[PDB]
């Protein structure tokens, strides 16, 4: 139910930096980010039409840490919902509790955030929510509870975030350690490199 292996390998495979490590130390120093994993890394022949789409899908999934069935479900939901499908999917992905936490800066990585969520550190509207897939709504305040507020990791995460660009769709307080999910993010607010359309196509086989 989770990917427990090497994180940088995934990144290498993808091509890009997936942000699977905190960002204290640059990704180029930790691993050969350009070279693909395994014995046959240096060889890089152009991929197929299907293959590129698949890769794209993987990238997105990897980024958020969502396994396949769940991803499929999300896609379906997006399709069902009104408006642009890929965009909807992206929004849904964002909405995940762990992701939100990460954005806020209470977790160094998304993985860390997820862990925190699991371990009953986070509350959503003053009620302890344990599910990483929990879809956080507009105007839903989300905070660290008083037990987990003393942790050194949390402050480190916050610091890291502060170095990292702040998302417009949230509003977080470092002292209070509570952030308000103000609105579901627009496509423009998210990263431009993610070809959602490819993903959509893949499932529209």
């Amino acid at each position: 139910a989770r990917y427990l292996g090497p994180k940088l390998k995934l990144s290498r495979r993808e091509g890009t930096d997936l942000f699977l490590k905190s960002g204290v130390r640059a990704i180029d120093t930790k691993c050969k980010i350009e070279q693909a994993p395994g014995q046959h890394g240096a060889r890089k022949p152009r991929l197929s039409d299907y293959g590129v789409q698949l890769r794209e899908k993987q990238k997105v999934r990897r980024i958020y840490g969502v396994l396949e069935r769940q991803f499929r479900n999300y896609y379906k939901e997006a399709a069902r919902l009104k408006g642009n499908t890929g965009e909807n999917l992206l929004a849904l992905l964002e909405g995940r509790l762990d992701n939100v936490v990460y954005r806020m800066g209470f977790g160094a990585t998304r993985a860390e955030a997820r862990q925190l969520v699991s371990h009953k550190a986070i509350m959503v509207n003053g009620r302890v929510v344990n599910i990483a897939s929990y879809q956080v709504s507009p105007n839903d305040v989300v905070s660290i509870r008083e037990k987990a507020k003393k942790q050194s990791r949390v402050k480190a995460a916050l610091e890291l975030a502060e170095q990292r660009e702040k998302p417009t769709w949230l509003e977080v307080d470092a002292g209070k350690m509570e952030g308000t999910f103000k609105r579901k993010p627009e496509r423009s607010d998210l990263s431009a490199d993610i070809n959602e359309h490819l993903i959509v196509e893949l499932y529209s086989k």
């Binding site: 039409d49 408006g83 499908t85 890929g86 965009e87 909807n88 359309h197 959509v200 196509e201 529209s204």
Partner: protein, 156 residues
Amino acid sequence: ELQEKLIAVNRVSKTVKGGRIFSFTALTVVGDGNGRVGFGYGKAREVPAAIQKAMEKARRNMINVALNNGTLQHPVKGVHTGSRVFMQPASEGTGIIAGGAMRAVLEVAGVHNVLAKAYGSTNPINVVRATIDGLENMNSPEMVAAKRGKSVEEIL
């Protein structure tokens, strides 16, 4: 600015007194991400050369296509030889739902959102041609208005 996609490359033979002389055909298609599209079919003893030739061919004899935003203006059929093709305009987000050679042509053309089936033959060369034909024939609202002696609001 122009994007160019080699759809297919196929090895073709000519029998001679000695034996078989092999050659390569390259089917490419190029477009500017707007109305302009053009396919090219190049042939040579080696692949890369053939591809280059195809590209060259494509770059000349392009064709303009009226695009309402990211999609087509109305459902359009296009036929050529075996390959008969249907393509239907679709809502933003849906992506290019189309198969093979057909997809490639659409992508370069700068249609982002289509629902497109290739009936009949799916011989890449023919199907791309069919697609092109379909695109070409497809008229815009303004054009139709002009034709009919009316305003755009009269037609809706």
